[PDB]
Amino acid sequence: SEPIEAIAKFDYVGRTARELSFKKGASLLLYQRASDDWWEGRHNGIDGLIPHQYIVVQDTEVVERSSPKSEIEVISEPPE
Amino acid sequence: MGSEPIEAIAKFDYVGRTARELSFKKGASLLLYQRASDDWWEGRHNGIDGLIPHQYIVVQDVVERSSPKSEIEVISEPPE
């Protein structure tokens, strides 16, 4: 399952160093849903966090990436 | 003694690999609620609840918290 394409529907200015900043209409790539409000993604070659409320996500497809990783998933394997 | 959360100290820096995991520096004071598996604990660092890899900490030595919850325990009550 490739990373999920999204487009910014509003401007966003990141508040911390972990967050992406982007303008309405920005092409975004989404690796993984982190929580209800947040995705891990990428904008213009930079990895960072993306607020869900500011984007529209392309769904012609995967649930693995669009749902947060579960505890049982994480703890079933050693850490990297 | 008794049922309190178990204290631990980070012996190595750790950067969380998923959104469920705590990140901490060597020497961090950690609080451990419940062993999740051999390699993982449910705990807390600096007010944030998350997962802590066993191999990165030293634990201060109930068995209740230091052993993973059993199936029979979990299935003995309804979901959830």
Tab-separated table of N, CA and C in Angstrom:
chain	number	residue	atom	x	y	z
A	1	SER	N	0.827	-1.258	0.000
A	1	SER	CA	0.000	0.000	0.000
A	1	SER	C	0.838	1.275	0.000
A	2	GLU	N	0.933	1.928	-1.143
A	2	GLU	CA	1.656	3.182	-1.228
A	2	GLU	C	1.140	4.250	-0.239
A	3	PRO	N	2.013	5.205	0.137
A	3	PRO	CA	1.527	6.406	0.794
A	3	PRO	C	0.322	7.097	0.086
A	4	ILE	N	-0.531	7.724	0.875
A	4	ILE	CA	-1.813	8.259	0.410
A	4	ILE	C	-1.665	9.727	0.004
A	5	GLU	N	-2.194	10.087	-1.157
A	5	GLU	CA	-2.121	11.468	-1.644
A	5	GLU	C	-3.208	12.300	-0.957
A	6	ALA	N	-2.888	13.554	-0.683
A	6	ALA	CA	-3.837	14.480	-0.100
A	6	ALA	C	-3.565	15.869	-0.649
A	7	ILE	N	-4.536	16.745	-0.465
A	7	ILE	CA	-4.395	18.165	-0.895
A	7	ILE	C	-4.824	19.036	0.279
A	8	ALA	N	-4.078	20.096	0.539
A	8	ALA	CA	-4.448	21.054	1.558
A	8	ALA	C	-5.654	21.867	1.129
A	9	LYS	N	-6.672	21.903	1.988
A	9	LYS	CA	-7.841	22.722	1.772
A	9	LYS	C	-7.785	24.057	2.535
A	10	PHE	N	-6.834	24.205	3.464
A	10	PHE	CA	-6.579	25.487	4.122
A	10	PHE	C	-5.069	25.644	4.320
A	11	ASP	N	-4.619	26.894	4.400
A	11	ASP	CA	-3.253	27.162	4.849
A	11	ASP	C	-3.062	26.612	6.275
A	12	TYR	N	-1.842	26.176	6.574
A	12	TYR	CA	-1.474	25.811	7.933
A	12	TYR	C	-0.015	26.198	8.218
A	13	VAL	N	0.194	26.857	9.342
A	13	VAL	CA	1.523	27.180	9.815
A	13	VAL	C	1.789	26.326	11.038
A	14	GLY	N	2.776	25.431	10.907
A	14	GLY	CA	3.191	24.554	11.969
A	14	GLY	C	3.519	25.292	13.253
A	15	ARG	N	3.103	24.755	14.400
A	15	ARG	CA	3.363	25.431	15.672
A	15	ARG	C	4.646	24.919	16.332
A	16	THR	N	5.019	23.658	16.104
A	16	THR	CA	6.255	23.080	16.640
A	16	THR	C	7.169	22.683	15.476
A	17	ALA	N	8.380	22.251	15.797
A	17	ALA	CA	9.375	21.839	14.789
A	17	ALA	C	9.044	20.538	14.108
A	18	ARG	N	8.060	19.806	14.631
A	18	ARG	CA	7.663	18.505	14.063
A	18	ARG	C	6.577	18.640	13.009
A	19	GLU	N	5.968	19.815	12.915
A	19	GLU	CA	4.860	20.046	12.021
A	19	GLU	C	5.236	20.718	10.692
A	20	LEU	N	4.611	20.237	9.618
A	20	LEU	CA	4.735	20.834	8.294
A	20	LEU	C	3.943	22.117	8.230
A	21	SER	N	4.421	23.063	7.405
A	21	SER	CA	3.634	24.237	7.045
A	21	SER	C	3.350	24.158	5.564
A	22	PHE	N	2.148	24.549	5.202
A	22	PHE	CA	1.700	24.492	3.802
A	22	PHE	C	0.565	25.477	3.509
A	23	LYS	N	0.375	25.726	2.223
A	23	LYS	CA	-0.652	26.606	1.765
A	23	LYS	C	-1.809	25.805	1.166
A	24	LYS	N	-3.003	26.381	1.232
A	24	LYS	CA	-4.145	25.798	0.573
A	24	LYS	C	-3.746	25.369	-0.834
A	25	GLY	N	-4.101	24.135	-1.228
A	25	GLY	CA	-3.779	23.630	-2.560
A	25	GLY	C	-2.508	22.826	-2.691
A	26	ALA	N	-1.715	22.802	-1.618
A	26	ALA	CA	-0.503	22.005	-1.524
A	26	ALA	C	-0.777	20.511	-1.702
A	27	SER	N	0.097	19.880	-2.467
A	27	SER	CA	0.127	18.457	-2.639
A	27	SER	C	0.841	17.860	-1.422
A	28	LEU	N	0.212	16.905	-0.752
A	28	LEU	CA	0.770	16.299	0.453
A	28	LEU	C	0.830	14.784	0.256
A	29	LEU	N	1.796	14.150	0.897
A	29	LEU	CA	1.902	12.678	0.913
A	29	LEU	C	1.707	12.218	2.358
A	30	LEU	N	0.882	11.186	2.584
A	30	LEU	CA	0.568	10.743	3.951
A	30	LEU	C	1.089	9.307	4.122
A	31	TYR	N	2.008	9.132	5.079
A	31	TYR	CA	2.524	7.811	5.428
A	31	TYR	C	1.552	7.051	6.342
A	32	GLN	N	1.119	7.707	7.401
A	32	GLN	CA	0.456	7.024	8.473
A	32	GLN	C	-0.338	7.965	9.331
A	33	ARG	N	-1.572	7.579	9.637
A	33	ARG	CA	-2.396	8.307	10.593
A	33	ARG	C	-1.754	8.145	11.962
A	34	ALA	N	-1.544	9.234	12.684
A	34	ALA	CA	-0.962	9.160	13.992
A	34	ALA	C	-2.051	9.158	15.084
A	35	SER	N	-3.067	9.973	14.882
A	35	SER	CA	-4.209	10.084	15.758
A	35	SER	C	-5.322	10.674	14.944
A	36	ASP	N	-6.489	10.852	15.558
A	36	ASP	CA	-7.655	11.437	14.892
A	36	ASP	C	-7.294	12.734	14.153
A	37	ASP	N	-6.481	13.567	14.805
A	37	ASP	CA	-6.211	14.918	14.337
A	37	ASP	C	-4.960	15.033	13.492
A	38	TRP	N	-4.158	13.968	13.389
A	38	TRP	CA	-2.790	14.059	12.888
A	38	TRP	C	-2.368	12.901	12.024
A	39	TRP	N	-1.588	13.242	10.999
A	39	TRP	CA	-0.901	12.318	10.112
A	39	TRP	C	0.575	12.577	10.123
A	40	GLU	N	1.319	11.509	9.897
A	40	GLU	CA	2.718	11.584	9.555
A	40	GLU	C	2.735	11.641	8.027
A	41	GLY	N	3.347	12.671	7.458
A	41	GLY	CA	3.461	12.782	6.036
A	41	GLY	C	4.695	13.538	5.559
A	42	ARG	N	4.545	14.132	4.388
A	42	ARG	CA	5.650	14.763	3.697
A	42	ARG	C	5.123	15.858	2.770
A	43	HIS	N	5.854	16.962	2.729
A	43	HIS	CA	5.505	18.085	1.869
A	43	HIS	C	6.803	18.623	1.317
A	44	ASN	N	6.933	18.639	-0.004
A	44	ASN	CA	8.069	19.243	-0.642
A	44	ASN	C	9.383	18.690	-0.085
A	45	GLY	N	9.447	17.375	0.002
A	45	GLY	CA	10.672	16.718	0.415
A	45	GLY	C	10.930	16.742	1.906
A	46	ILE	N	10.022	17.286	2.696
A	46	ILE	CA	10.227	17.383	4.121
A	46	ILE	C	9.181	16.497	4.806
A	47	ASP	N	9.653	15.561	5.640
A	47	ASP	CA	8.789	14.775	6.496
A	47	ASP	C	8.337	15.571	7.690
A	48	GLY	N	7.081	15.446	8.044
A	48	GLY	CA	6.589	16.015	9.287
A	48	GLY	C	5.123	15.711	9.517
A	49	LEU	N	4.565	16.304	10.551
A	49	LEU	CA	3.163	16.083	10.923
A	49	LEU	C	2.206	17.051	10.207
A	50	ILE	N	1.016	16.533	9.896
A	50	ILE	CA	0.010	17.185	9.116
A	50	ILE	C	-1.308	17.032	9.872
A	51	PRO	N	-1.990	18.167	10.149
A	51	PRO	CA	-3.268	18.155	10.782
A	51	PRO	C	-4.381	17.721	9.817
A	52	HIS	N	-5.110	16.683	10.207
A	52	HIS	CA	-6.217	16.114	9.441
A	52	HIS	C	-7.265	17.110	8.987
A	53	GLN	N	-7.649	18.030	9.866
A	53	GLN	CA	-8.700	18.997	9.561
A	53	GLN	C	-8.365	19.932	8.430
A	54	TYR	N	-7.102	19.972	7.998
A	54	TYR	CA	-6.629	20.998	7.007
A	54	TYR	C	-6.469	20.438	5.605
A	55	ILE	N	-6.794	19.152	5.425
A	55	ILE	CA	-6.513	18.456	4.193
A	55	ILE	C	-7.747	17.671	3.747
A	56	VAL	N	-7.755	17.334	2.456
A	56	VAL	CA	-8.668	16.347	1.935
A	56	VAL	C	-7.838	15.154	1.424
A	57	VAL	N	-8.245	13.965	1.775
A	57	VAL	CA	-7.473	12.756	1.506
A	57	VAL	C	-8.078	11.971	0.342
A	58	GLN	N	-7.218	11.471	-0.522
A	58	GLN	CA	-7.641	10.700	-1.644
A	58	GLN	C	-7.951	9.240	-1.247
A	59	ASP	N	-9.211	8.806	-1.357
A	59	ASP	CA	-9.600	7.404	-0.995
A	59	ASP	C	-10.139	6.616	-2.146
A	60	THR	N	-9.257	6.231	-3.051
A	60	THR	CA	-9.634	5.256	-4.069
A	60	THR	C	-8.672	4.066	-3.957
A	61	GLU	N	-8.864	3.341	-2.853
A	61	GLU	CA	-7.926	2.345	-2.339
A	61	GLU	C	-8.611	1.499	-1.247
A	62	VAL	N	-5.427	2.897	1.912
A	62	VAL	CA	-5.640	1.600	2.572
A	62	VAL	C	-5.765	1.885	4.067
A	63	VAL	N	-6.538	1.049	4.754
A	63	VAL	CA	-6.946	1.269	6.146
A	63	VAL	C	-5.766	1.168	7.098
A	64	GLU	N	-4.826	0.273	6.786
A	64	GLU	CA	-3.551	0.151	7.521
A	64	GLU	C	-2.906	1.522	7.772
A	65	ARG	N	-2.763	2.313	6.720
A	65	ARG	CA	-2.164	3.665	6.838
A	65	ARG	C	-3.136	4.725	7.352
A	66	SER	N	-4.440	4.562	7.113
A	66	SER	CA	-5.400	5.601	7.459
A	66	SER	C	-5.950	5.521	8.885
A	67	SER	N	-5.669	4.403	9.575
A	67	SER	CA	-5.941	4.215	10.996
A	67	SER	C	-4.626	4.280	11.810
A	68	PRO	N	-4.687	4.835	13.027
A	68	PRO	CA	-3.441	4.850	13.844
A	68	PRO	C	-2.962	3.452	14.095
A	69	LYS	N	-1.651	3.265	14.218
A	69	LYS	CA	-1.130	1.945	14.589
A	69	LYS	C	-1.673	1.560	15.993
A	70	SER	N	-2.130	0.328	16.133
A	70	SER	CA	-2.649	-0.147	17.416
A	70	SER	C	-1.503	-0.543	18.385
A	71	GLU	N	-1.802	-0.607	19.689
A	71	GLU	CA	-0.816	-1.049	20.658
A	71	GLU	C	-0.388	-2.461	20.298
A	72	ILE	N	-1.363	-3.340	20.077
A	72	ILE	CA	-1.025	-4.749	19.867
A	72	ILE	C	-0.095	-4.910	18.667
A	73	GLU	N	-0.304	-4.139	17.597
A	73	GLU	CA	0.619	-4.082	16.443
A	73	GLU	C	2.029	-3.717	16.862
A	74	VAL	N	2.154	-2.639	17.591
A	74	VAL	CA	3.461	-2.166	17.996
A	74	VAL	C	4.172	-3.159	18.922
A	75	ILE	N	3.459	-3.707	19.903
A	75	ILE	CA	4.130	-4.501	20.912
A	75	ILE	C	4.397	-5.952	20.491
A	76	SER	N	3.900	-6.349	19.318
A	76	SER	CA	4.037	-7.721	18.840
A	76	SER	C	5.428	-7.940	18.257
A	77	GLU	N	6.184	-6.856	18.060
A	77	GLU	CA	7.529	-6.975	17.547
A	77	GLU	C	8.495	-6.158	18.419
A	78	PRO	N	9.778	-6.549	18.444
A	78	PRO	CA	10.782	-5.722	19.109
A	78	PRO	C	10.866	-4.331	18.483
A	79	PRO	N	11.438	-3.356	19.224
A	79	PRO	CA	11.665	-2.026	18.625
A	79	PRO	C	12.836	-2.062	17.642
A	80	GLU	N	12.857	-1.100	16.716
A	80	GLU	CA	13.940	-0.899	15.748
A	80	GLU	C	15.123	-0.171	16.393
B	1	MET	N	6.730	-1.622	46.611
B	1	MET	CA	5.718	-2.281	47.506
B	1	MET	C	4.292	-1.976	47.038
B	2	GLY	N	3.431	-2.948	47.294
B	2	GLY	CA	2.044	-2.873	46.906
B	2	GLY	C	1.850	-2.709	45.413
B	3	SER	N	0.827	-1.948	45.053
B	3	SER	CA	0.272	-1.948	43.710
B	3	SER	C	0.714	-0.754	42.883
B	4	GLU	N	1.524	0.146	43.429
B	4	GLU	CA	1.876	1.372	42.683
B	4	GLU	C	2.605	1.139	41.381
B	5	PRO	N	2.512	2.111	40.460
B	5	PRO	CA	3.322	2.011	39.239
B	5	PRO	C	4.816	1.848	39.556
B	6	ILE	N	5.524	1.160	38.688
B	6	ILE	CA	6.914	0.789	38.895
B	6	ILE	C	7.843	1.855	38.306
B	7	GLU	N	8.836	2.275	39.096
B	7	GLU	CA	9.783	3.294	38.622
B	7	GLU	C	10.831	2.614	37.749
B	8	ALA	N	11.298	3.352	36.767
B	8	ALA	CA	12.403	2.929	35.931
B	8	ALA	C	13.228	4.146	35.544
B	9	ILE	N	14.419	3.859	35.032
B	9	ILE	CA	15.313	4.925	34.500
B	9	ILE	C	15.795	4.520	33.132
B	10	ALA	N	15.774	5.461	32.187
B	10	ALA	CA	16.348	5.197	30.851
B	10	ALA	C	17.861	5.041	30.896
B	11	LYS	N	18.359	3.925	30.355
B	11	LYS	CA	19.782	3.702	30.260
B	11	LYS	C	20.346	4.061	28.898
B	12	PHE	N	19.474	4.270	27.910
B	12	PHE	CA	19.867	4.767	26.590
B	12	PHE	C	18.810	5.753	26.091
B	13	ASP	N	19.232	6.688	25.236
B	13	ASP	CA	18.286	7.500	24.491
B	13	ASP	C	17.411	6.590	23.628
B	14	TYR	N	16.159	6.990	23.443
B	14	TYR	CA	15.244	6.267	22.527
B	14	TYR	C	14.350	7.257	21.810
B	15	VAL	N	14.306	7.133	20.497
B	15	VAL	CA	13.370	7.876	19.698
B	15	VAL	C	12.272	6.925	19.231
B	16	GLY	N	11.040	7.216	19.650
B	16	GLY	CA	9.861	6.415	19.282
B	16	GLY	C	9.697	6.247	17.781
B	17	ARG	N	9.404	5.030	17.331
B	17	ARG	CA	9.343	4.739	15.931
B	17	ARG	C	7.914	4.882	15.405
B	18	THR	N	6.909	4.775	16.268
B	18	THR	CA	5.514	5.009	15.930
B	18	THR	C	4.896	6.027	16.879
B	19	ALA	N	3.674	6.450	16.582
B	19	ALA	CA	2.997	7.495	17.347
B	19	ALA	C	2.572	7.022	18.734
B	20	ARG	N	2.682	5.724	18.986
B	20	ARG	CA	2.291	5.125	20.289
B	20	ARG	C	3.426	5.121	21.300
B	21	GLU	N	4.661	5.384	20.821
B	21	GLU	CA	5.860	5.237	21.613
B	21	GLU	C	6.387	6.538	22.177
B	22	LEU	N	6.843	6.481	23.424
B	22	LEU	CA	7.501	7.610	24.091
B	22	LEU	C	8.905	7.756	23.509
B	23	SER	N	9.401	8.992	23.491
B	23	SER	CA	10.805	9.260	23.221
B	23	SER	C	11.418	9.880	24.488
B	24	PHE	N	12.637	9.487	24.786
B	24	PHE	CA	13.314	9.900	26.021
B	24	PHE	C	14.814	9.801	25.871
B	25	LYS	N	15.493	10.459	26.795
B	25	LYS	CA	16.938	10.517	26.832
B	25	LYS	C	17.441	9.618	27.946
B	26	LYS	N	18.626	9.076	27.761
B	26	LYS	CA	19.338	8.410	28.835
B	26	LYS	C	19.216	9.222	30.127
B	27	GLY	N	18.850	8.539	31.215
B	27	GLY	CA	18.705	9.167	32.523
B	27	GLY	C	17.330	9.672	32.888
B	28	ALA	N	16.414	9.629	31.918
B	28	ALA	CA	14.997	9.925	32.117
B	28	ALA	C	14.352	9.057	33.178
B	29	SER	N	13.561	9.704	34.006
B	29	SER	CA	12.748	9.047	34.995
B	29	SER	C	11.480	8.598	34.284
B	30	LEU	N	11.136	7.324	34.414
B	30	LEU	CA	9.991	6.742	33.697
B	30	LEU	C	9.105	6.059	34.707
B	31	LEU	N	7.822	6.068	34.435
B	31	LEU	CA	6.835	5.390	35.281
B	31	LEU	C	6.185	4.283	34.439
B	32	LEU	N	6.065	3.078	34.995
B	32	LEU	CA	5.603	1.910	34.237
B	32	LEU	C	4.310	1.441	34.875
B	33	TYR	N	3.243	1.454	34.071
B	33	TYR	CA	1.932	1.018	34.510
B	33	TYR	C	1.782	-0.514	34.377
B	34	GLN	N	2.159	-1.047	33.225
B	34	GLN	CA	1.799	-2.426	32.855
B	34	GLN	C	2.675	-2.974	31.772
B	35	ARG	N	3.260	-4.146	31.999
B	35	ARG	CA	4.044	-4.837	30.992
B	35	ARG	C	3.088	-5.211	29.899
B	36	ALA	N	3.439	-4.915	28.648
B	36	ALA	CA	2.572	-5.243	27.549
B	36	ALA	C	3.000	-6.573	26.898
B	37	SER	N	4.303	-6.749	26.770
B	37	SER	CA	4.913	-7.964	26.252
B	37	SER	C	6.327	-7.985	26.791
B	38	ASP	N	7.113	-8.989	26.405
B	38	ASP	CA	8.540	-9.079	26.809
B	38	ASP	C	9.299	-7.773	26.540
B	39	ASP	N	9.042	-7.164	25.375
B	39	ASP	CA	9.864	-6.083	24.869
B	39	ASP	C	9.300	-4.702	25.180
B	40	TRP	N	8.100	-4.635	25.763
B	40	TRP	CA	7.339	-3.399	25.875
B	40	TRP	C	6.562	-3.222	27.165
B	41	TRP	N	6.535	-1.969	27.628
B	41	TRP	CA	5.724	-1.516	28.740
B	41	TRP	C	4.811	-0.392	28.318
B	42	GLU	N	3.655	-0.330	28.960
B	42	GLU	CA	2.813	0.831	28.963
B	42	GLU	C	3.306	1.698	30.136
B	43	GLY	N	3.713	2.942	29.874
B	43	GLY	CA	4.164	3.833	30.919
B	43	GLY	C	3.866	5.296	30.679
B	44	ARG	N	4.683	6.131	31.281
B	44	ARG	CA	4.508	7.569	31.226
B	44	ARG	C	5.878	8.259	31.366
B	45	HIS	N	6.057	9.328	30.579
B	45	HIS	CA	7.257	10.146	30.655
B	45	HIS	C	6.825	11.581	30.561
B	46	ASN	N	7.129	12.372	31.587
B	46	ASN	CA	6.881	13.808	31.556
B	46	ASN	C	5.411	14.106	31.193
B	47	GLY	N	4.513	13.397	31.863
B	47	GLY	CA	3.097	13.629	31.704
B	47	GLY	C	2.482	13.015	30.471
B	48	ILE	N	3.248	12.303	29.662
B	48	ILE	CA	2.715	11.734	28.445
B	48	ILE	C	2.703	10.211	28.613
B	49	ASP	N	1.530	9.594	28.422
B	49	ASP	CA	1.377	8.135	28.421
B	49	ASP	C	1.796	7.563	27.088
B	50	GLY	N	2.568	6.498	27.101
B	50	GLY	CA	2.895	5.812	25.876
B	50	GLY	C	3.674	4.547	26.123
B	51	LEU	N	4.137	3.914	25.057
B	51	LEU	CA	4.913	2.693	25.134
B	51	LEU	C	6.431	2.908	25.296
B	52	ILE	N	7.066	2.029	26.069
B	52	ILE	CA	8.464	2.133	26.465
B	52	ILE	C	9.084	0.761	26.212
B	53	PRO	N	10.154	0.743	25.393
B	53	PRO	CA	10.864	-0.490	25.115
B	53	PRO	C	11.714	-0.936	26.315
B	54	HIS	N	11.483	-2.171	26.755
B	54	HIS	CA	12.178	-2.795	27.884
B	54	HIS	C	13.705	-2.727	27.801
B	55	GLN	N	14.255	-2.947	26.609
B	55	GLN	CA	15.701	-2.968	26.407
B	55	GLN	C	16.411	-1.639	26.623
B	56	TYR	N	15.651	-0.556	26.747
B	56	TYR	CA	16.235	0.807	26.906
B	56	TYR	C	16.184	1.354	28.326
B	57	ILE	N	15.679	0.553	29.276
B	57	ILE	CA	15.453	1.020	30.640
B	57	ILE	C	16.014	0.030	31.658
B	58	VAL	N	16.154	0.514	32.883
B	58	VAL	CA	16.386	-0.352	34.045
B	58	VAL	C	15.204	-0.175	34.966
B	59	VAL	N	14.612	-1.277	35.381
B	59	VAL	CA	13.421	-1.247	36.183
B	59	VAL	C	13.753	-1.468	37.640
B	60	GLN	N	13.096	-0.726	38.500
B	60	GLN	CA	13.285	-0.916	39.929
B	60	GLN	C	12.472	-2.117	40.477
B	61	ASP	N	13.130	-3.151	41.020
B	61	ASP	CA	12.414	-4.314	41.636
B	61	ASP	C	12.693	-4.465	43.109
B	62	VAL	N	4.379	-4.738	41.882
B	62	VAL	CA	3.911	-6.109	41.865
B	62	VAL	C	4.189	-6.815	40.524
B	63	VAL	N	4.113	-8.143	40.611
B	63	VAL	CA	4.157	-9.059	39.473
B	63	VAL	C	2.953	-8.798	38.577
B	64	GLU	N	1.829	-8.415	39.186
B	64	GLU	CA	0.633	-7.953	38.463
B	64	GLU	C	0.983	-6.990	37.305
B	65	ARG	N	1.735	-5.947	37.621
B	65	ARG	CA	2.121	-4.948	36.606
B	65	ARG	C	3.293	-5.375	35.738
B	66	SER	N	4.168	-6.234	36.249
B	66	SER	CA	5.411	-6.565	35.546
B	66	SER	C	5.310	-7.753	34.605
B	67	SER	N	4.179	-8.460	34.684
B	67	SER	CA	3.772	-9.496	33.742
B	67	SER	C	2.621	-9.009	32.820
B	68	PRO	N	2.641	-9.411	31.533
B	68	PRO	CA	1.541	-9.003	30.649
B	68	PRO	C	0.234	-9.532	31.169
B	69	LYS	N	-0.846	-8.792	30.930
B	69	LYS	CA	-2.186	-9.322	31.281
B	69	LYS	C	-2.439	-10.631	30.533
B	70	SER	N	-2.958	-11.623	31.230
B	70	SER	CA	-3.248	-12.923	30.593
B	70	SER	C	-4.560	-12.922	29.749
B	71	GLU	N	-4.701	-13.868	28.820
B	71	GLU	CA	-5.952	-13.997	28.085
B	71	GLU	C	-7.100	-14.229	29.061
B	72	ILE	N	-6.920	-15.198	29.962
B	72	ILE	CA	-8.026	-15.557	30.827
B	72	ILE	C	-8.490	-14.365	31.656
B	73	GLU	N	-7.563	-13.530	32.124
B	73	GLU	CA	-7.925	-12.257	32.776
B	73	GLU	C	-8.808	-11.372	31.884
B	74	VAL	N	-8.343	-11.129	30.677
B	74	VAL	CA	-9.034	-10.239	29.749
B	74	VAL	C	-10.405	-10.735	29.343
B	75	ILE	N	-10.526	-12.032	29.069
B	75	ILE	CA	-11.799	-12.547	28.601
B	75	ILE	C	-12.827	-12.747	29.712
B	76	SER	N	-12.411	-12.554	30.967
B	76	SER	CA	-13.266	-12.771	32.128
B	76	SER	C	-14.217	-11.606	32.335
B	77	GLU	N	-13.999	-10.502	31.622
B	77	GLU	CA	-14.922	-9.376	31.651
B	77	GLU	C	-15.341	-8.988	30.232
B	78	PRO	N	-16.536	-8.388	30.078
B	78	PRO	CA	-16.998	-8.025	28.735
B	78	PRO	C	-16.149	-6.931	28.096
B	79	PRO	N	-16.255	-6.782	26.765
B	79	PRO	CA	-15.672	-5.603	26.111
B	79	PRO	C	-16.536	-4.335	26.343
B	80	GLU	N	-15.978	-3.138	26.485
B	80	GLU	CA	-14.583	-2.869	26.854
B	80	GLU	C	-14.417	-1.378	27.057
